Symmetry: D2
Subunit: 276 residues, 4 copies
């Protein structure tokens, strides 16, 4: 718990509505304002989904460029990580295309799983073509794993030379209905499983909904990094809607200050994530 | 390791070929002969997939009835458990239909996962309609779980009253490329996770390929039950093709005898699995 | 994590020196002042060792009565838990005798271990006669466990009817040089091992030195209770001396408030610990 | 699980009686006969305690030399590992002295624990002087661990350069009343904890009494080595006395042959244990 802590803010996502979370940033300007407040509260990475002005999820490259430019202009030092997951059911071609904008980092979903009432599909041949696109556009991946078997699947892609990023950054996404939950036994199992299978990988955790607090506090004291935000959780407390993404980031920064864990500077975040 | 041991023989499966495993039983008569040898070697359950005479996987109800009748006639006491998984890619309607034959037991796959180069699809709405069909035809399920999150998903179906079977029998299917592996850390994690989430559930393990021996020896001494067979593993030793499914069953029976774990009688197997 | 949190303050101990920790309470008056400040900061239990005015550890019943009375006079709501461990090397007769003062609670050390440069001795026959004295004097024990095997040893005393207290309160004491450390894998293992062996037991954790923060944050989100204080840790941060025991308690209360875990009232602490 | 398996036979011990186990070897001639039968059954190490002709435990160097010479004369290939634990209650000077006989290997008990009705004492200063005697006499240690905290204590002696043996061989001694039990969760925890704290250490497990089978089957498939014998367990099955130590060794050799795990040759056992 003395190693620097990287906080990611997943500020928008594909499914959160403005009716449930009135402070949900939808436009590039709203997303830039939120990103500045999150950076000042301690966030070093923004996990970015884009929306049309009507709130529907978007995959348009011009809209992604608009949001990336707006965020970059308010906080040049923040790391802008784009989502290649998008909205469940979106075509894989549309999910892959924004890598052509050459972001510093982007997500790489490592498997298929039932996801609420639907299926989040990542066909093995599509995972390989996405992994190949990361190499061609020189984008560093954040590999998203929702279950134990996805760690093994990623290890096999490393062994075959399909994923060559080293060190590799994994994010455990815990709490999806259909995926592994965020209970402490599970996060401890996952970090130890990852250490066995991909020994040099670094990791972060996203705890959906009620799992935000248990995943965050374990990650605090096990060297992991943490994601928070409206994409994953709109509540500050049970039954109490959050005021902003920055409010969620600031609580994690306050707990890190209480326990003496320093927040990573932008330079340290880029060094840990091998973005230089 | 003093509790009775139930051995399941998965004798055929959907993908194993006769060229790789010349002793693969394909016809109902061949499957009955294998089932008798497996029963005499210690198996109390047969996990049944059917094939056409040309070796292609089948879902025909008349072919399922032919195989069930042939096995029943050689060993009336064996438990015949039919597969509702079938061949990856088969239509869900064809996978569900054989429950109408009212077998004593059948498999119920609890989630979707990448499975080798393809996806084994179990849409959440199809899992619910299959669970409903088990109730209507008074069939006891064996719930197949390939990942941690599938245990939580099954617990939510129990909470909603969609799965009412109690005690419920779970089988951990470990070693699929895309699913959780069969390493000892994983089987220990899964039995403890299941005890937390579905405390009265019983369990078995199927260790695909190289995971057959590690899963079997852990299950031996943790009270679990074991599945073996050509569907999951065609080798008796690394690089040494097995002579029969009964050879694989007999090794497990010999190890159980060495350590003093009794094999379940047919009556004990039916009592543990709540088939009476 | 809405379950009430009981904070224990171990304010003095037997070995801490005022040379290392200038604000260590030594006398009954100093201990009463600290106990009131700890109670106001959120502590519901004081774990009490006594000292002579010169700072030497004491086992005298008149001195224990002086300290108990001084604390009760200024903060009657707090639970005063006396130590039967005392200073390593103390005679077992002197360690047992203060149970005759009929405190609400007292510690019951469940095994022997190397403890720094010495041995903390708890002979099996002495553990049994101490367990019998808890029954004789109607005192509730807090059972101190430093290793996995002490949980099994306590389970055997329960089976034999030597310990009949139900529910039983266990405290994991982690970080002793010679005992189990406070790394997160260990505290997760211990709570799970205790759930298997003594399913109805409640638990707390004391994290010695550098293990204070990792044990506290894991206990926060797993339903455990927490001990802090100069007996276990004199530092607020690595290389930063704590200002008082109440400063350590207040940090835990602030983290609990951040995450929405309520602090137990005195009535709830007595109900959970079965002190009524 | 193709890694060679080293079997140790702990043939006599200090406490086993011929009244409970009529075929217990007591004299040097009896111990030599048993050692040859154990070697032929697959054992590569003899863990040696000596007795007087009346069955009383001994620490005499002339009696140790008699037993070592008798075993070497009939089976020179076996590794003779002497006990420095001896009978609980024995003086530390008498326990250390036989290292002057310059055996190939000897045990090094890494902590104190309650042991049945007594205490097995290993004062921290005595552990250090024993570690120094291993260097003085050029003997390789087998470090005996009964609890998690003993692994940390050994790691601290390595850090201080008190133990310089590399690779270090640890034996987990599980099932002592007072020590960690041999349940599968515990052996999995211990091998993983040892991998975190002493990454290059090799390990074996001794499962006392009823824990012999669960520890052996887990070690079989996790790369560990196994100890068996009358010192730890006199029963072949629950309520079935073992016929000899070689009968216990032969069962482990049969299970290893069933699963395809080779037994170490004497040369491989000396290479793995760094005895050349
Ligand atoms: Mg949708
Ligand atoms: Mg706002
Ligand atoms: Mg196919
Ligand atoms: Mg044949
Ligand atoms: Zn996303
Ligand atoms: Zn099948
Ligand atoms: Zn104390
Ligand atoms: Zn011994």
């Amino acid at each position: 718990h003395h190693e620097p802590l990287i906080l990611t803010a997943a500020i928008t996502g594909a499914e959160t509505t403005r009716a449930d979370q009135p402070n949900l940033p939808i436009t590039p300007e709203e997303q830039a304002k939120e990103a500045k407040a999150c950076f000042e509260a301690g966030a070093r990475v923004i996990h970015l989904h884009i929306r049309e002005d009507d709130g529907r999820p978007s995959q348009r490259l011009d809209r992604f460029q608009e949001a990336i430019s707006a965020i970059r202009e308010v906080v040049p030092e923040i790391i802008i990580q784009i989502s290649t997951g998008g909205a469940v059911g979106e075509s894989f071609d549309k999910r892959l295309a924004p890598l052509a904008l050459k972001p510093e980092m982007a997500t790489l979903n490592a498997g298929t799983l039932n996801f609420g009432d639907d299926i989040f599909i990542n066909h093995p041949a599509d995972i390989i073509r996405l992994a190949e696109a990361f190499k061609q556009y020189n984008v560093v991946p954040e590999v998203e794993v929702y279950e134990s078997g996805m760690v093994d699947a990623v290890a096999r892609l490393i062994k075959k030379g399909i994923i060559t990023q080293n060190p590799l950054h994994i994010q455990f996404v815990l709490g999806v209905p259909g995926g592994m939950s965020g209970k402490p036994k599970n996060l401890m199992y996952m970090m130890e499983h990852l250490k066995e299978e991909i020994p040099t990988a670094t990791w972060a955790v996203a705890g959906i909904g009620r799992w935000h607090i248990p995943t965050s506090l374990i990650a605090m004291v096990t060297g992991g990094h943490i994601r928070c935000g409206f994409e994953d959780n709109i509540f500050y407390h049970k039954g109490v809607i959050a005021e902003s993404n920055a409010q969620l980031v600031a609580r994690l920064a306050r707990i890190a200050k209480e326990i003496g864990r320093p927040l990573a500077t932008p330079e340290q975040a880029r060094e840990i994530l091998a973005l230089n």
